[PDB]
Enzyme design. Structure first.
Site, PDB file in Angstrom:
ATOM      1  N   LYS A 296       1.048  -1.096  -0.179  1.00 21.56           N
ATOM      2  CA  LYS A 296       0.108   0.342  -0.142  1.00 21.56           C
ATOM      3  C   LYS A 296       1.477   1.792  -0.189  1.00 21.56           C
ATOM      4  O   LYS A 296       2.045   1.805   0.577  1.00 21.56           O
ATOM      5  CB  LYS A 296      -0.794  -0.068   1.075  1.00 21.56           C
ATOM      6  CG  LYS A 296      -1.692   1.090   1.476  1.00 21.56           C
ATOM      7  CD  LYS A 296      -2.761   1.095   2.144  1.00 21.56           C
ATOM      8  CE  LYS A 296      -3.089   1.995   2.994  1.00 21.56           C
ATOM      9  NZ  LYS A 296      -4.345   1.861   4.428  1.00 21.56           N
TER      10      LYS A 296
ATOM     11  N   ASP B  16     -10.469   5.860  12.618  1.00 22.99           N
ATOM     12  CA  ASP B  16     -10.367   5.607  11.573  1.00 22.99           C
ATOM     13  C   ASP B  16     -10.192   4.516  10.500  1.00 22.99           C
ATOM     14  O   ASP B  16     -10.589   4.095   9.649  1.00 22.99           O
ATOM     15  CB  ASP B  16      -9.667   6.593  10.326  1.00 22.99           C
ATOM     16  CG  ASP B  16     -10.773   8.066   9.610  1.00 22.99           C
ATOM     17  OD1 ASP B  16     -11.704   7.996  10.422  1.00 22.99           O
ATOM     18  OD2 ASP B  16      -9.978   9.219   9.568  1.00 22.99           O
TER      19      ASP B  16
END
Ligand SMILES: O=c1[nH]cnc2c1ncn2[C@@H]1O[C@H](COP(=O)(O)OP(=O)(O)OP(=O)(O)O)[C@@H](O)[C@H]1O
Ligand SMILES: O=c1[nH]cnc2c1ncn2[C@@H]1O[C@H](COP(=O)(O)OP(=O)(O)O)[C@@H](O)[C@H]1O
Ligand SMILES: O=c1[nH]cnc2c1ncn2[C@@H]1O[C@H](COP(=O)(O)OP(=O)(O)O)[C@@H](O)[C@H]1O
Lengths: 300, 315
Positions: free
Chosen positions: A109, A233
């Site tokens: 990522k 989050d």
């Protein structure tokens, strides 16, 4: 013969660098344990060839590995052999910002400078939490973290072990957040080859996941740990594979490899295999409970 | 597992560098031909680690390798495996500016920036010479050339194969240049353990070498070709290195070692400069003879005096 041939040159550097750093590490003894400085260490390599070996690599590039010893230890504690990690990155270019290795074993990522700083702030506590779990955890399994420099621009990458199976076709994917808000698949995303259905559509679809308790025993520990570190989050990723849809076999998986996989109960309407893990933990306490609350009511 | 422990950080860096470039090179296919770019090419690496892997290497160093494809080809043309070359450099620290690999197979000379430039300007003719003589030459066999940077300081190094055997002790050595001038070894030199004797020391001792006809003439043909080549490049100050091994003395020394608790036979694939003494010769000896110091009275004149001297050096 590792020609680092990639769909674009930053991936050639990724391959070259993972190869390079893992070989260097094979020349570094594994310690009796990690020291504080290991959590502040990095390795840096600047390559500057001229008229040489340019077929697939760039001639000038940089590669930086954050905390090589800590991540080599994590790799060990997660059951991953370094040469396996190396081959999954270097034997063929990663594929498609989110990448996978050619064998879909690990995902790469792109992250920001902020995220790299955040992992540095969490790393010693993350590592001791994984020591105390004996690795039995739903958090992302961080295997390595790199900064690449190609053509002047720096790119940050975090490598994790894949939530989904590297072999079984995954039939539906959901990104659950537990919010008291409005997360639903966008009409553009709803027409994707494989959609990502956020929280609302999991109840507006009506999917349950049938099976039992050790899962919540691990998840509660995890989200307690993340809240206690002021992390918010984060999402929970759920993947559904329909055996019936369909050498090797259907519904057949290796649990030493697809660590998160879960066979469905006999009581499920369809014959299914589920995959479940927490993701995106680089950024509070309320968020924990609400989040946990939602998933408290997915299982049957 | 390779720690690269060495008595000095620069040697550690050298071991790291040869290991790194040889393993890199193993991922680079072996070309059909060499291209001209290959003779201006170089590989650079710059390392700045931090709190990581600093037991043996420095945190910060640089490593440069000159024309790596060309020297890889040269290695192959001199019968040297890359794997072997890296093991001789990396398995254990080289020893004692001149160094030798631990197994005594290769020689590492610290050289100058001008020497590196001269090697560059002659490399392509050198490689063609090696090609068209099939590596049969008394000239140096150049295997690598590197630039190390340790503590902000550059150090140039040229790797060559040993004129001397990696097994057989050398009991005398001479450095002959054929010069008209009085080359003689100092009282200081002549007081070392293995002193490096020069021309007039060779003559005052009346040393002659009995090799037999066949290898004498192979040697003189090799030498004619080699020094013609050198002269056509305006190169001088080179020497003939001759080492003498006394088989009987080696037998005695080895037995004195064994007592503290074949003979005179060598492998010409390895000791490529080695010659047995003639069957009907006074002492059973083995010589090692080659040309050395190649990166630099006309050059035709130096060629002439040199050849006429080394011609008489042996019978
Ligand atoms: O390809 C070449 N054809 C001819 N001559 C060359 C060549 N390549 C190098 N020389 O040859 C010495 C090497 O020194 P070096 O070049 O390794 O140093 P760099 O140039 O990278 O500059 P620096 O890093 O200090 O800023 C200096 O006489 C220079 O000439
Ligand atoms: O490990 C993985 N395997 C396969 N897909 C993943 C994996 N991790 C994330 N994804 C996919 O990429 C998306 C991005 O997740 P994440 O929450 O970490 O990014 P974010 O910071 O933009 O919210 C996931 O919701 C899912 O679509
Ligand atoms: O290949 C070798 N094996 C063993 N000794 C060598 C070898 N090459 C050089 N030497 C030693 O180094 C000495 C000087 O070599 P060279 O003439 O090339 O350097 P220079 O520029 O200081 O004169 C030789 O006379 C000999 O003493």
């Amino acid at each position: 013969v590792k020609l680092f041939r990639a769909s674009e040159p930053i991936l050639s550097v990724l391959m070259w660098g993972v190869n390079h750093t893992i070989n260097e590490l094979s020349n570094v003894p594994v310690p009796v344990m990690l020291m504080p400085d290991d959590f502040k260490a990095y390795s840096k390599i600047k390559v500057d060839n001229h008229l040489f070996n340019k077929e697939n690599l760039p001639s000038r590039f940089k590669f930086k590995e954050y905390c090589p010893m800590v991540f080599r230890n994590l790799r060990e504690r997660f059951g991953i052999d370094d040469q396996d990690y190396q081959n999954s990155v270097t034997r063929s270019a990663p594929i498609n910002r989110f990448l996978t290795t050619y064998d879909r074993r690990f995902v790469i990522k792109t992250v920001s400078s902020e995220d790299v700083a955040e992992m540095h702030n969490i790393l010693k506590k993350y590592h001791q939490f994984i020591v105390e779990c004996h690795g039995n955890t739903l958090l992302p399994q961080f295997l390595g973290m790199y900064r690449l420099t190609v053509d002047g621009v720096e790119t940050y990458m975090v490598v994790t072990r894949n939530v989904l199976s590297h072999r079984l076709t995954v039939h539906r994917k959901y990104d659950l957040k537990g919010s008291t808000v409005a997360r639903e698949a966008s009409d553009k995303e709803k027409a994707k080859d494989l959609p990502t259905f956020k929280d609302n559509d999991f109840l507006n679809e009506g999917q349950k996941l049938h099976v039992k308790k050790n899962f919540l025993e691990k998840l509660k520990r995890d989200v307690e740990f993340l809240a206690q570190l002021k992390i918010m989050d984060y999402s929970l990723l759920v993947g559904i594979h329909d055996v019936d849809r369909a050498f090797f076999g259907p519904g057949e998986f290796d649990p030493s490899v697809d660590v998160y996989a879960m066979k469905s109960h006999e009581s499920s309407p369809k014959k299914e295999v589920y995959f479940m893990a927490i993701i995106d933990i680089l950024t509070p306490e309320q968020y924990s409970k609400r989040f946990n609350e939602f998933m408290s009511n997915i299982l049957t």
